[PDB]
Design an enzyme around this catalytic site. Sequence first.
Site, PDB file in Angstrom:
ATOM      1  N   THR A  86       0.820  -1.201   0.000  1.00  0.00           N
ATOM      2  CA  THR A  86       0.000   0.000   0.000  1.00  0.00           C
ATOM      3  C   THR A  86       0.859   1.258   0.000  1.00  0.00           C
ATOM      4  O   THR A  86       2.024   1.244   0.398  1.00  0.00           O
ATOM      5  CB  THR A  86      -0.927   0.003   1.210  1.00  0.00           C
ATOM      6  OG1 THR A  86      -0.145  -0.021   2.406  1.00  0.00           O
ATOM      7  CG2 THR A  86      -1.828  -1.213   1.184  1.00  0.00           C
ATOM      8  N   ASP A  87       0.262   2.358  -0.465  1.00  0.00           N
ATOM      9  CA  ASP A  87       0.990   3.618  -0.566  1.00  0.00           C
ATOM     10  C   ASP A  87       1.304   4.209   0.800  1.00  0.00           C
ATOM     11  O   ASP A  87       2.339   4.860   0.965  1.00  0.00           O
ATOM     12  CB  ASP A  87       0.196   4.612  -1.408  1.00  0.00           C
ATOM     13  CG  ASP A  87       0.031   4.155  -2.841  1.00  0.00           C
ATOM     14  OD1 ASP A  87       1.053   3.858  -3.489  1.00  0.00           O
ATOM     15  OD2 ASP A  87      -1.119   4.083  -3.317  1.00  0.00           O
ATOM     16  N   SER A 112       2.172   8.724   4.446  1.00  0.00           N
ATOM     17  CA  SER A 112       1.331   8.881   3.263  1.00  0.00           C
ATOM     18  C   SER A 112       2.206   9.395   2.130  1.00  0.00           C
ATOM     19  O   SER A 112       2.652  10.545   2.163  1.00  0.00           O
ATOM     20  CB  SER A 112       0.168   9.833   3.522  1.00  0.00           C
ATOM     21  OG  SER A 112      -0.546  10.092   2.327  1.00  0.00           O
ATOM     22  N   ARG A 113       2.450   8.549   1.129  1.00  0.00           N
ATOM     23  CA  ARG A 113       3.294   8.946   0.011  1.00  0.00           C
ATOM     24  C   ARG A 113       2.584   9.900  -0.937  1.00  0.00           C
ATOM     25  O   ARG A 113       3.225  10.459  -1.832  1.00  0.00           O
ATOM     26  CB  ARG A 113       3.763   7.713  -0.757  1.00  0.00           C
ATOM     27  CG  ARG A 113       4.709   6.823   0.019  1.00  0.00           C
ATOM     28  CD  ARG A 113       5.181   5.666  -0.831  1.00  0.00           C
ATOM     29  NE  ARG A 113       6.057   4.772  -0.088  1.00  0.00           N
ATOM     30  CZ  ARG A 113       5.660   3.651   0.496  1.00  0.00           C
ATOM     31  NH1 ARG A 113       4.402   3.251   0.437  1.00  0.00           N
ATOM     32  NH2 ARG A 113       6.546   2.914   1.157  1.00  0.00           N
ATOM     33  N   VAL A 114       1.281  10.093  -0.770  1.00  0.00           N
ATOM     34  CA  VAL A 114       0.495  10.922  -1.672  1.00  0.00           C
ATOM     35  C   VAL A 114       0.091  12.237  -0.994  1.00  0.00           C
ATOM     36  O   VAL A 114      -0.851  12.901  -1.420  1.00  0.00           O
ATOM     37  CB  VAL A 114      -0.723  10.144  -2.204  1.00  0.00           C
ATOM     38  CG1 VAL A 114      -1.473  10.895  -3.306  1.00  0.00           C
ATOM     39  CG2 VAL A 114      -0.294   8.774  -2.691  1.00  0.00           C
TER      40      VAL A 114
END
Lengths: 125, 57
Positions: A86-87, A112-114
């Site tokens: 998961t991201d 959270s990569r986003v």
Amino acid sequence: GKHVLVVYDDLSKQAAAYRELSLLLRRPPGREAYPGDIFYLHSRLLERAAKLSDAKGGGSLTALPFVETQAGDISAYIPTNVISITDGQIFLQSDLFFSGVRPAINAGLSVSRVGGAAQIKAMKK
Amino acid sequence: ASLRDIKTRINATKKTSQITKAMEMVSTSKLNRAEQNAKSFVPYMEKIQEVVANVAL
């Protein structure tokens, strides 16, 4: 072209069921008696969530799988497999829970990569 | 408990030991510098008291 939110309540329990089926079918197990293709199973499930391009209608599906650990052991096999896919991850902690901090998001470990791309400008400020 | 349970408490206690040792060293140097003023003060008090020994009697 619509937008869908999908929540899987217990990927740990799904993995337990698949392990039971594999061992009843007499397939060789890996570590913690899990079959070797559980990661293939979970990756094939999760990587179907995507944000389609404009040529494809612009629809999207976001996924929120859940994983339950025992006594805070996030180095176990299923947690490692799910984390590596998961991201981002959100960690809820009982020690934060009982000290009044509810919900118990541990902001230090949560990732959270986003980030930023998923926030409005006022929030980003 | 778990190894994951144990490691955090070990880390916290090691950091506490580090901080306490550092403060102990600082207090040691402070004590060394503090005794000098008592050494300097003793002659003044004695020299005033010896004059008192005849003026105030």
